[PDB]
Structures are given as structure tokens and as C-alpha cells.
Amino acid sequence: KMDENEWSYHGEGNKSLVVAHAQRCVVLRFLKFPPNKTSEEILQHLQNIVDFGKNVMKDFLGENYVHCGEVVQLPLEFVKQLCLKIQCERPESRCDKDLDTFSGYAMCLPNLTRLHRPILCVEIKPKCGFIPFSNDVTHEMKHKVCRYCMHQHLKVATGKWKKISKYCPLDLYSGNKQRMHFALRSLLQETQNNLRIFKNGELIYGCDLKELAHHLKPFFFPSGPHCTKAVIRELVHVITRVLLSSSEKARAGALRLGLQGPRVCEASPSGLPKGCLLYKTLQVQMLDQLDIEGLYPLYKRVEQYLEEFPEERKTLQIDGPYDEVFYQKLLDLSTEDDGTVAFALTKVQQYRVAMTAKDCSIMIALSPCPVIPSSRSRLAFSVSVLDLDLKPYESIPHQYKLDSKIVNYYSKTV
Ligand SMILES: O=P(O)(O)O[C@@H]1[C@@H](OP(=O)(O)O)[C@H](OP(=O)(O)O)[C@H](O)[C@H](OP(=O)(O)O)[C@H]1OP(=O)(O)O
Ligand SMILES: Nc1ncnc2c1ncn2[C@@H]1O[C@H](COP(=O)(O)OP(=O)(O)OP(=O)(O)O)[C@@H](O)[C@H]1O
Ligand SMILES: [Mg+2]
Ligand SMILES: [Mg+2]
Ligand SMILES: [Zn+2]
């Protein structure tokens, strides 16, 4: 049975909220809505996240790297009881959207920050690892600077964050250890929503560098005096070594997309290992072959069709089920347009999957002891992907509108 005080606030984006259970190693992921959906709509929506996880993302990213635990039902009093308790924990910016309190459904997943031994967990939101290559783009700046580094200017000017991050995803997504070190230092300096650190299921950093060292010193140095620089450097190196870790150097990927350059970004102040999670993530991100500029015309062709034929929306699995036939249709990587709805639709569904891979999080576990990297302790490590719900069909015009603004505003600033 469910107890209000046994669950604690863990985190949120702007689609969902997560609460971790103090005893068992599980979390519950709840949806979020404004004060202004049906119970059935939520059930399918939540079940679509599991189907998409099982039937699409386990193929692209691997069975062991993905965990999308089943949908679960709860009593409506418990959800209310929990909601009010936690309201103070939530940061004030997220509080526009309220918690899913009326449905009584949520998604139960394993807590990737918890599992007598201690545990250190680093969560990263790496963002898009390539600079767009497509001839459909009408701004030449998009071929030079990454989305992330461009986007940074508008976010700081808007007052989202205090200053521009030096993190460029192409530094992290390169194979080069020196570039990967610089990227991780840059995330440590200016965390934003791209870095978080947990110790025994407790957040300890990215919503002070010397305060981090207090917490991390027991791990890497379980007596010699070790300064902050020493502690933070070994965190950077171990993590770099976990991101360069691959268990599948030989096998052929489901997506064999080629990295069309450039591999260095201008805004940033011999490639990834074949089986590593960062490589595999980058491959599913590259399903965006056309760019939004690009893809948006093909969105209109599909919309035009669906407005003519409303019944076919369910028929063509636009909002699921995200099943084996859905997966199979993503494998047509041909970029030659034949003016057909089928072509446009294929590219639209591929673009949504790429959007999902561009906004996903990577959770790295570390525990002192299977799979082990070199360190001044002896650490057993695990890797996971988080935040793999398919991005909606309806947001594609928003991506087109936003992309224009990011590039134009950057082009003004430079
Ligand atoms: O606006 P984008 O493209 O940078 O990405 C959004 C993210 O913005 P960010 O740049 O990471 O601050 C945004 O993150 P924040 O809530 O702004 O931290 C979300 O991840 C959003 O995804 P969803 O629609 O909530 O599932 C993301 O929305 P999508 O565009 O992926 O739908
Ligand atoms: N299984 C899990 N184990 C541990 N922490 C988790 C788990 N799932 C989610 N979290 C935490 O909860 C946070 C919010 O969840 P999540 O990012 O998946 O939702 P979201 O609303 O889709 O966010 P986003 O804005 O990034 O799209 C994560 O950033 C992470 O810190
Ligand atoms: Mg997230
Ligand atoms: Mg999301
Ligand atoms: Zn960059």
C-alpha cells in the first residue's frame, strides 16, 4: 500500500515530474498539465511511452541501456496527498504546469541514482551532437555553429541562465579525450539543465565547485591531502572513460548513417567508439537528415493529407501504436523526394525520433566494488538512457519557428 511520506521529490522537466521512494529502488514518473485530458487519453499516452521504449529505442540503443518500466495505477487520494506535500520542493519556474492529479496513472521505473555500498551518479543532457549538413537550410550560419551554442545567446538574453556556457556538444561527441575533457569542465562550470550530480539518490550539484569536492572525495580517495582540482579532474577522466566505453565494437548498427561534417564548431572555444552509447545516440539523432527547413515542407504535405482524410490519422499510426511495423518504416533512410505523402510521412516520423534522441538524458552510475574503469578506487559502472518519450507530431511547426529565431538572433549578436 501507498504512503505519502515514503516518496520524495526527485526532479522534473516540463512534461513530467519524478518522485523517488526512500526504501525500494523505484521512482514514479507523473505527467504535468496546466490548470486548463481524459483518463483514457493519459493511459494510452503513458502506454505509448513504454511501447516506443520497447519496440524502437531498445533496437537503436540496446536492451541493457534502456529501462522503460510498466504503467501503474494508484488511488486518487494518494496522488492528491503526495502533490500538496511536494509543492514546496519544486522550483518556482516549473510551477506554471500542475501535476497529473485527476487520472490516477503513472509510470514506474527503476531509480537509476540508487542502484550497503555508496553510489555516485552523473546525469547529462548532451543535446545534438552534429552540425546540420542538408542543402535545404537557407541560413549559412547553421553549417558553421551548432544548435546548442547558437541557442545559448537567446537563453542568456532572455534570462533563462546567467551566462553563456562554453560547452559545445561536438566536443563531447568527438572521440578526442582532450575535447571531451573541456566539454565536461564547461558543464561543471555552467550546469544549466545539462548536468546534475547525485550521491546515494540525493542531488548534490546542478539544480559551488569546492562543495562538490567534499562529497566526491570519499569516492575517488576512500591520508593524502587532495585539493579540489585533483578531485574534479578524476571525475572528468572517469566520466570521459565511461563515455568512451563500448561493449559492441563489432556488430552492425540498425542505423548506419555517416557523419557528414564539420566535426568542429566555430562557437566552441578520430571519432567515437562504435558500440558506445554516445555514438548510438548520435546515430538516432541523425535521422534528421533534412533539417527542420527542410522537414517542415514535408510536414505540411502530411497535414494537408490528414485534413483531407481525418480517419486515416489513426490508420497511419501517427499517434501510435509505436509497434514493430512503426519501427520497420523508420528504416527507409532514402533522402530522395518523390513528391509523395508516404515519403513525407516517413521523414516526419524519423524527425520525431531524432527530436527525442536530441533531448534525452544519459545517466552514469559509479560504485566502488562486472564492468570497471581505471581509477584510484575500483569502480563498478552502469550506463542508461532517460527521457525517451516520442516527441509529438504537433510541435514540428514550433521547431521551424524557434529555429529561425535562434539563427537570426545569433546572426545579429555574433
Ligand atoms: O527547445 P529545445 O529544442 O531546446 O528543447 C526543449 C528543452 O529545452 P532546452 O534547450 O533543453 O532548455 C526543454 O528543456 P527545459 O524544460 O527548457 O529545461 C525540454 O527538454 C523540451 O522537451 P519536452 O517538450 O519537455 O519533452 C525540449 O523541447 P523539444 O523542442 O525537444 O520539443
Ligand atoms: N528512472 C529514473 N531514475 C532516476 N532519476 C530519474 C529517473 N527518471 C527521471 N529521473 C529524474 O527526473 C528528471 C525529470 O525526468 P525526465 O527528464 O525524464 O522528464 P521530462 O519532463 O521529459 O524532462 P525534459 O524537460 O528533459 O524533457 C530527470 O532529469 C532525472 O533527474
Ligand atoms: Mg529530462
Ligand atoms: Mg521529455
Ligand atoms: Zn558548438
Author numbering: 5 to 40, 43 to 121, 129 to 220, 229 to 243, 249 to 295, 311 to 410, 420 to 464
Quote the passages of the study that discuss this structure, keeping the authors' original sentences:
Inositol 1,3,4,5,6-pentakisphosphate 2-kinase (IP5 2-K)3 is a key enzyme of higher inositol phosphate (inositide, IP) metabolism. IP5 2-K is present in yeast to mammals and catalyzes the synthesis of phytic acid (inositol hexakisphosphate or IP6) from IP5 and ATP. Mouse IP5 2-K folds in two lobes, N- and C-terminal lobes, connected by a hinge, thereby conserving the general fold scheme of PKs and IPKs, and in a similar way, both lobes coordinate the nucleotide between them. The CIP lobe represents more than half of the protein and is specific to IP5 2-K enzymes.
We have solved the structure of Mus musculus IP5 2-K (mIP5 2-K) at 2.4 Å resolution from a truncated form lacking the 21 C-terminal residues (ΔC-mIP5 2-K). In addition, we present two different crystal forms, including one or two molecules in the asymmetric unit, respectively, the first showing much better resolution (2.4 versus 3.2 Å). Unexpectedly, the formation of the ternary complex (mIP5 2-K + IP5 + ATP) was achieved by protein incubation with IP6 and ADP. The triphosphate moiety is tightly bound to the N-lobe of the enzyme through polar interactions and to the C-lobe through two magnesium ions. Regarding the inositide substrate, IP5 is tightly bound to the enzyme through its five phosphates. Residues Lys-138 and Asp-400 make direct interaction with Pγ and/or the nucleophile 2-OH. The distance between the 2-OH and Pγ oxygen is 3.2 Å suggesting an in-line transference mechanism probably in agreement with an associative mechanism. Pγ is oriented through a magnesium ion (Mg1) coordinated to Asp-437 and to Asp-439 in a second sphere. Asp-437 also coordinates a second magnesium ion (Mg2) together with Ser-402 through a water molecule. The Zn1 site is formed by residues from two CIP lobe elements: Cys-159, Cys-162, and Cys-181 from CIP-I and Cys-291 from CIP-II.
